[PDB]
Amino acid sequence: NLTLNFGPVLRLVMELSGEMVRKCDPHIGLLHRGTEKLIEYKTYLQALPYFDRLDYVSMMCNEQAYSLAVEKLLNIRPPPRAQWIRVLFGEITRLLNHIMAVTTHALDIGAMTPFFWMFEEREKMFEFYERVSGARMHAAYVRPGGVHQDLPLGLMDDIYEFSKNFSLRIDELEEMLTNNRIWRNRTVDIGIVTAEDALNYGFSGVMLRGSGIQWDLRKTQPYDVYDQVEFDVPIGSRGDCYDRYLCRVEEMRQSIRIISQCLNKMPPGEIKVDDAKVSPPKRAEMKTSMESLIHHFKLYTEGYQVPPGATYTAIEAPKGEFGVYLVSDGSSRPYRCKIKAPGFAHLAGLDKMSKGHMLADVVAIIGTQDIVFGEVDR
């Protein structure tokens, strides 16, 4: 057969028989940076920014996974307002990831116009990030114990104004793709996964719901305040790229539904756990109280000690089940931090999903898995 080394950050070594794909062998590691080994040399607060940079399209959903794991070991609970902010920006982040997933997928197979319409919406959502953290992408805003700062006055009104119009933006995306026969030809019956294969290959997220499996960690194993919001889980029926595209577009509509409830049900209170041995005190009291300055000093040099133990904490990140197996030895630095990137199991199944398809279908299959190589390689 013909062997093609589609070099670059992905290197596909395919074995083509005519126009069909007989074997796809992804070569990864072109973005492997040793994140897991670096985390062992950092305190728990110092390792938080490393998680913005794994799935760098869903930055504030990666922080939440790490924060839930450290909080579980710490045996603390973030305050209720901090949990609504974490569920509000979890869904804003899911809109960010699903815009990048659908439109980049569309741009790969030719449709270049929806990318520019929706990346203006991403630009406005990057402003919400920058008004709570000061950074457009790598906020480092969700932390063990809550969030760094409180929402500035006027943000929630600006989130409301953005959310009113966003359904119309999705409807314009659907006027270009959903019924367009050319798009349906590129996605329908492409990359079919049986529900039993999807479970055994470690798939998660819409890679399961696209095959009809009724599973969503936000509803089966809820975290923060997802048990207090009402939304629907879109389920596919054919297991193909088209159904996975409709699940993602429908999840954006449900994210707007959740954002509508977070804005109304946002409670008052503080935004980080009122325990100064875990969360630093306010600067006003760090400059007046002896205890506060001691605890500020030691939380920013040594860090908080975490009891010995090991947790596997997972969330329903936009890409899929994102989790961390975090091992504490009692000190202020993690002993082990294994990162479970959902795309790692998905991309491992590209070979199976590409059997019996043409070379141009491999581009559509990689798009439907929603692969970002920050998390695949870590």
């Binding site: 950092k42 607060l45 110092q46 390792a47 938080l48 920014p49 490393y50 116009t113 319409w117 203006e120 630009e123 402003e127 920058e130 008004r131 709570v132 953290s133 000061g134 950074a135 790598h138 480092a140 760094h148 700062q149 409180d150 500035p152 314009e172 006027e175 270009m176 019924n179 367009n180 026969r181 050319i182 009724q214 009402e230 939304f231 629907d232 889980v233 879109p234 389920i235 596919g236 029926s237 054919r238 088209y242 159904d243 409709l246 699940c247 429908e250 630093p280 306010k282 600067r283 760090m286 400059k287 300055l293 500020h296 000093f297 920013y300 040099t301």
Partner: protein
């Protein structure tokens, strides 16, 4: 709760089959796509006229690191190394000694701006608001060595941007 995205049966009554035949032969749904992009042609573009117009920012924006002073001109930094100990990228290098008048001040304060991840942890950890991230985001250089700031560059930034750093801190110090 859940919903089905693609679990509908197309009608087989003659009218519906002919409605689908018209769509296939007369390209009706491909012509809605043309209508949706003709709409955008007559919408005003979202482009701004950079560099004469700038993208909006907030007082929390994290930009170029800078070293500040008290209203008397005395440096705020008292060489405590909390910023150095918390920098995730290990980008701060500090050395200190007793100044000529007995004060506790740095003889070295370097930031490798190519190691820095612009995270703002240093300005969180400083008890005297000495090191901050100013609002500047236009300091691209032509050589790698211009991004290795020493204490003079950082003090120059503070004198250069104090008028704007002070007003950004005044607008946001009550949230921190």
């Amino acid at each position: 709760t859940y919903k089905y995205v693609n679990l509908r049966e197309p009608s087989m009554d003659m009218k519906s089959v002919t409605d689908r035949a018209a769509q296939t032969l007369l390209w009706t749904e491909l012509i809605r796509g043309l209508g949706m992009t003709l709409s955008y042609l007559f919408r005003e573009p979202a482009t701004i006229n950079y560099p004469f117009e700038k993208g909006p920012l907030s007082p929390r924006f994290r930009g170029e690191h800078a070293l500040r002073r008290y209203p008397s001109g005395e440096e705020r930094c008292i060489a405590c190394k909390l910023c150095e100990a918390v920098c995730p990228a290990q980008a701060i290098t500090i050395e200190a000694e007793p100044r000529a008048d007995g004060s506790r001040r740095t003889t070295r304060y370097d930031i490798d701006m190519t190691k820095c991840i612009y995270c703002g942890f240093c300005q969180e950890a400083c008890p005297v608001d000495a090191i901050v991230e100013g609002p500047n985001f236009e300091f691209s250089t032509e050589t790698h060595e211009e991004l290795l700031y020493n204490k003079e560059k950082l003090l120059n930034n503070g004198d250069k941007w104090e008028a704007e750093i002070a007003a950004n801190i005044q607008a946001d110090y009550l949230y921190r």
